[PDB]
Amino acid sequence: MNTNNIKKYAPQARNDFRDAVIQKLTTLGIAADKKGNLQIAEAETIGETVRYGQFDYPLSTLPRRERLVKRAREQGFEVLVEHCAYTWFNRLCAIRYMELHGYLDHGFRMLSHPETPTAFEVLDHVPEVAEALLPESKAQLVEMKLSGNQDEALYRELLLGQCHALHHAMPFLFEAVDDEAELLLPDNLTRTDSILRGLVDDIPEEDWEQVEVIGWLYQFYISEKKDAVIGKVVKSEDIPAATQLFTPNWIVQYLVQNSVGRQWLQTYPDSPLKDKMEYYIEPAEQTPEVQAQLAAITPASIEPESIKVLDPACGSGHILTEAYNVLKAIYEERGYRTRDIPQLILENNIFGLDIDDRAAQLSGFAMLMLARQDDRRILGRGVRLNIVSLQESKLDIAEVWTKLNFAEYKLLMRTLALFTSAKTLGSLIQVPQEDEAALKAFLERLYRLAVEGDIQQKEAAAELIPYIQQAWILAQRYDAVVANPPYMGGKGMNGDLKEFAKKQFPDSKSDLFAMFMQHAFSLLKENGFNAQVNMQSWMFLSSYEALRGWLLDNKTFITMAHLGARAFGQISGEVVQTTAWVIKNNHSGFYKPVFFRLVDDNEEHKKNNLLNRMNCFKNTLQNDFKKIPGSPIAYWATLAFINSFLKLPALGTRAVKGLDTNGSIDVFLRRWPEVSINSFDALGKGNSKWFPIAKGGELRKWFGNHEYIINYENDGIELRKNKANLRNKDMYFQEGGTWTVVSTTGFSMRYMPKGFLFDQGGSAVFCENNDELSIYNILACMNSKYINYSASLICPTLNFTTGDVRKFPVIKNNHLEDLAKKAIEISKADWNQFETSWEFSKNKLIEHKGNVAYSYASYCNFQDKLYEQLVNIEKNINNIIEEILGFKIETTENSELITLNSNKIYRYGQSETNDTFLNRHRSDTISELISYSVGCQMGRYSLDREGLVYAHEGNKGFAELAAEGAYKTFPADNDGILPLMDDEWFEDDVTSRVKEFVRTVWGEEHLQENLEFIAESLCLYAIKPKKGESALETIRRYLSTQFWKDHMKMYKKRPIYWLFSSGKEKAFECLVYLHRYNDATLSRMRTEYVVPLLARYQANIDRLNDQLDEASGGEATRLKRERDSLIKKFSELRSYDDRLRHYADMRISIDLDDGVKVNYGKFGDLLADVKAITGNAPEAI
Amino acid sequence: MAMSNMTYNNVFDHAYEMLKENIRYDDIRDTDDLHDAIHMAADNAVPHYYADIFSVMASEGIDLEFEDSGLMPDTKDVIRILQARIYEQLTIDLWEDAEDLLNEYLEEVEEYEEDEE
Amino acid sequence: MAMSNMTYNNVFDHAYEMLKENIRYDDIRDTDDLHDAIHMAADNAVPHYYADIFSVMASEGIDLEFEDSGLMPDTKDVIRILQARIYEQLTIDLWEDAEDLLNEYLEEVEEYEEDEE
Ligand SMILES: [Mg+2]
């Protein structure tokens, strides 16, 4: 509400301000078009009356208006419009705050009339306000009081008089001399219909009682522009606009107490401020050498006037207020006059800088308000202020130093040249110290020329002061820096900024916050304190390894607090992880850093933990982090782990990156089921056209993930034309190990046999020619808990690459080889029990005998035995070595998971765990059996031999196989087309052959029991149970309803058996084998399958006509319904026959090399789910 | 609120009772007049609460596939299709066993005719 | 089984994870090439158990009226229509937030050039 009011009022207020400014400019004669070209109106005056639109401005205002045009020559129209709008908004906010605080000379509110809305309190108190502000015009104002009118700029005249009165001690916002905005006063702005009444009414009274409203106006009022500019990358326009945010006060206090308060306490132990601190952290133990060095370098005592504080990003100014409060407390401890303390603090105790003029003005206003509320001699004398910075430098010469009444000339020219392109470079511009003191004397000369001399001397001094002041401020060599660098994202990467970073230090040129940290270190004197906060993503990246090494080589840590995530109440901030740290400039090799881990804690809980000071790990050195490569400074890691990390050798150049392709993977990579086996390399040697490839997928250990095929004809000449990378064309076709570069969940390594290729996604490791180490030992080590934890710790981002794997330690043993061999054998045995692997041999339910339930129980027992054996082997291999040293508990449940299809948790999701897995799984098994049955009917599999039987192209050579005797126990179809209906009219009905298959496999003694078991098993999960029906009807319903979906899901939208369907009513459905499709298939389907069906429908239609007529009665509703059923089917089948004839007249020839994805769309609206496979809607001729 | 437990058996029992009420009130005497008597009996049986409709389809006793292609509404709302499926199933079930009530009412009215006096 | 408590939020989370995995695996570096990725992510996310579908349709987050008339299947089954509705809802919701992942992946992969070494 209170905070949301400013947010909801900022956009319309800003729009109204901009519209008023542009309207007043156009009425004056300054107009801007879409292109931005100036449209200055002609300055043709008839004489003593300017011919403007509707206003008659005085001639004296004509030159000043020209200055605005001059501004148009030097700055954009939008820039000046925004500046004027901000100036007016700031002035109105300041006067409203002053009148609400009731600290005026006359104590009367100006804009708001108490107990009288939309009026002014000064209207009744005209003489008192007049004599308080402008006595010389009091009587004339009294005359206006006699008129009871003139609500025009006369009120604005009184406001300007009040501003001139306040200019005596507040010169940075209100100016006694005539300003440029006085010419551009909005028309009828004093009227009750203007925006002033809206400002008065919208802003309540309660929200003025807060002290952070300055930050609210700083941030919320500009949030609309930040949202507008977040869409596109900014280059040099919105550098300060997009870097505005509020900083919580408690972290500011914590940093301040550990930066200056800690230094103040360490300067002399006799400081009684020990009980005055709450966030101070006392070091516990240090080596005597560093203690002696600190005692030697620490002075006995220093004066309280030597404190130097720098705030490169003051922002709202809360840090300035906190520093002022701390300094006031210190001076009160020392003992000084309560009135001169603010003066001396503002003189030589508090300093700050920024990039935005608005932030500087707001900070100055807040500081002056605090001084007024604290000091009583202020606002009557005046004092210089240091808030603004990085102002533009004018190139006018021969006039600024002409009135100077003249070594310093060269320095002045140099500092004038430096401040030209200052907005882009921010606060990173530095000035050598040697030219500081004399420059300061130059400033004093300006103070000697500020009031001495005529108006020209004063103007020259005012023009020359700000740059000298900024240079002196930035060249103070402060001893304490407390600031939070802004956050730079994708928009922060600029070409000119990158060039400047390259010109500057390139070690940490990736991000701006690192450069800010480096500059703050540079601008800090010896034995200084630097307390800062930043994001977490600076200690776990390869780029910052050199930065971390430099930091640990030249400086030392003092106190680091891991704020972590869950900050600011978890509002926005997709990356809210952050850390705070305090660094001493002195180098301490054997220091004892102290770390506090407040991660994953809410703000209230984090504050409670900080107050209680728990979870402290002061049990690490500073050089110990150098042991682990990359210096990943961590506090939870024990010293034993660090010591043992370097005691073992790591993998050398045995890791090799995979090959790369530049695109068009759709024409190279295809799945193995959809190509001929003659061209396959793994099966049927003789032609090298297709080769296995490795890419890496989900989590899987020791074996698996064999499902992709690449084209490598003639060592590669087709893809050599592109020549993407062809990386390492020497280590191919060799056994070794493979692992996934992608994140997934964890880290795992799998065996890789001969005749394989590896891609970028899956990187490969090969043993040397005669290396002592063995591949099986490496596989055993890489799947261990220790290596998993090390990999997780080194790269939390989960981006395992070649450079991050060449440092993992490896051990040497002998039992690990046989353990790895047994694990690989078990994994391969588990992987080779499904149809999706090219080593499938036989189903697991037909190799037993007896009853179907007995076979299912045997299968379940076999799976359980495999699972138990692998669990025991994993436990043994974990307990065999375990480094025979210290170890930690299971980091995650993922690191202690067994990856097998037998393990139901890994198969049916690790989250859900219910008893329904005892049913669903069962159903699945039965489904697979049915699929195998079809494989026997189509000729792909046989009950005599093992493995694939026929998978060639064009249905050529099948006659030879049939005559030889491959299919003798269970004969296969000859046409290659399997009909699928709801009647036994055809001899190729799938249900009948399924029954025959079951009877052949399990005899003819308990066929009914087996059929009942199958039907009951299917209805558990696959389909919905019905009221009453036989087993055969359930089988037929499953085949006609829930078989196409399961097959299409198993092969992942690359079907092998294509489905031809008639349409809405299932009048005609057929399955066609892809590998047995010649150019004379459609004609046979039309000839011997469709026409007899039409004849049967016609012969059955008329017979039921007489049946309904005879004995018509209560059954007439039950009857004749089939008569309605057969009417639609006949017409649908006739239309399908017409389409089939049209397509069969054209002899279509297909090629398996193209792939299912393209070949599936060459038959129009004859197949099923054309869009779900090809991706585009089918085209109808 | 969003949780309910209504089965198809409750709907069938309600439809049966309403059919008996209709055949008693309207004095149905011929088989061909039963159609409308059944139709109205179905109309005040399909629930309008979406939770009840979704719970009914997951119960036991109702299939998940239409039998007549002429009873599918031409709309874009999924509630209408489910309601039409329930209506068709109820119509089939009620017409399956409906002559019993008709002949019972006929024999009762014949008994209490009292020689048309 | 019948007492299944599956909500639209779980389906959306699974689809989001699958989309992230697919975009990481395929390494797509353009805005207009995300159609295939989102199609693949949405296809392999809808459930197949009828009880799960009926529990999802009664959850919070998914409406009951189609927005496009071209996505209506032409069949006599009711599971297909519900699955198509869920697929369309998931597609819209995921396409609502899709540029963030692409730009994040691009800016992350930009920092691994190694100066072509
Ligand atoms: Mg055949």
Residue numbers in the entry:
A (entry chain A): 1 to 406, 431 to 1205
B (entry chain C), C (entry chain D): 1 to 117
Q: What text comes from the article?
A:
Ocr inhibits BREX defense by binding BrxX in vivo. 57% of the extracted particles yielded a 2.8 Å global resolution map (BrxX:Ocr) corresponding to a BrxX2:Ocr2 complex where two individual BrxX monomers interact with a dimer of Ocr via their TRDs and CTDs. The two BrxX monomers are oriented at an angle of 125° relative to each other; however, the complex displays imperfect symmetry due to the local flexibility of the individual components resulting in varied local resolution. We resolved one monomer to ~2.8 Å clearly defining all structural features except for a flexible loop between residues 395 and 420. The map resolution for the second BrxX monomer stretched from ~3.4 Å around the core of the particle to ~4–6 Å at the periphery; hence, we rigid-body fitted the first monomer model into the density of the second monomer (see “Methods”). Ocr is highly negatively charged, and its interaction with BrxX is largely driven by electrostatic contacts with the positively charged groove on the lower half of the BrxX monomer. To form direct contacts, Ocr utilizes two pairs of tyrosine and glutamic acid residues that form hydrogen bonds with four residues of BrxX TRD: T821, N823, T768, and the main-chain carbonyl of G721. Three out of four of these TRD residues are also directly involved in DNA recognition or binding: N823 directly interacts with the A4 in the target strand of the recognition site, while the main-chain amide of G721 interacts with the phosphate backbone of T5′ base in the non-target strand. Ocr is additionally stabilized by the BrxX CTD via a salt bridge between Ocr E67 and BrxX R1145; the latter residue also interacts with the DNA away from the recognition site. The DNA mimic protein Ocr exploits this non-specific DNA recognition property to sequester BrxX (Stage VI).
